[PDB]
Amino acid sequence: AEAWYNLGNAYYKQGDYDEAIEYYQKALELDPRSAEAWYNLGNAYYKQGDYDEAIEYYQKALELDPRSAEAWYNLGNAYYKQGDYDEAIEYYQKALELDPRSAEAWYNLGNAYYKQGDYDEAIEYYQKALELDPRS
Ligand SMILES: [Cl-]
Ligand SMILES: [Cl-]
Ligand SMILES: [Cl-]
Ligand SMILES: [Cl-]
Numbered sequence: 001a002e003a004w005y006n007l008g009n010a011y012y013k014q015g016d017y018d019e020a021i022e023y024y025q026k027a028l029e030l031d032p033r034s035a036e037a038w039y040n041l042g043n044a045y046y047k048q049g050d051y052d053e054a055i056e057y058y059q060k061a062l063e064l065d066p067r068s069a070e071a072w073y074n075l076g077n078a079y080y081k082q083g084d085y086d087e088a089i090e091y092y093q094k095a096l097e098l099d100p101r102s103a104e105a106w107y108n109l110g111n112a113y114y115k116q117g118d119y120d121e122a123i124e125y126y127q128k129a130l131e132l133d134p135r136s
């Protein structure tokens with residue numbers, strides 16, 4: 001499983017996402033408990049703009065490792081890309097539970113409320129993002 005997974009990563013690093021997907025799937029066929037293989041398979045589909053597959057595979061990663069702030073944040077991003085702003089808020093909130101000092105998560109939480117027309121909530125979360133990164 002380790003050699004298929006790292007072959008997938010060597011493709012992913014070059015932006016060869018079709019091949020990354022092929023080889024991550026071979027890794028998972030052999031070891032389906034690898035949170036990291038599911039998460040990176042999700043990432044390869046995300047990079048291709050296939051958000052339905054990204055969401056499916058991030059959800060599997062997070063079943064195996066619910067302490068992955070990165071998987072929560074990227075699941076929020078995949079739902080944001082689909083215009084599902086309440087699910088973006090749901091998963092950004094989980095990422096911030098695990099890393100309250102993530103300027104990126106505060107900012108994207110702000111952008112989900114902005115897309116809903118809740119501009120005062122957006123202001124609140126952009127203010128938190130700027131408390132952490134005043135040069136953004
Ligand atoms: Cl992970
Ligand atoms: Cl889940
Ligand atoms: Cl929604
Ligand atoms: Cl919160």
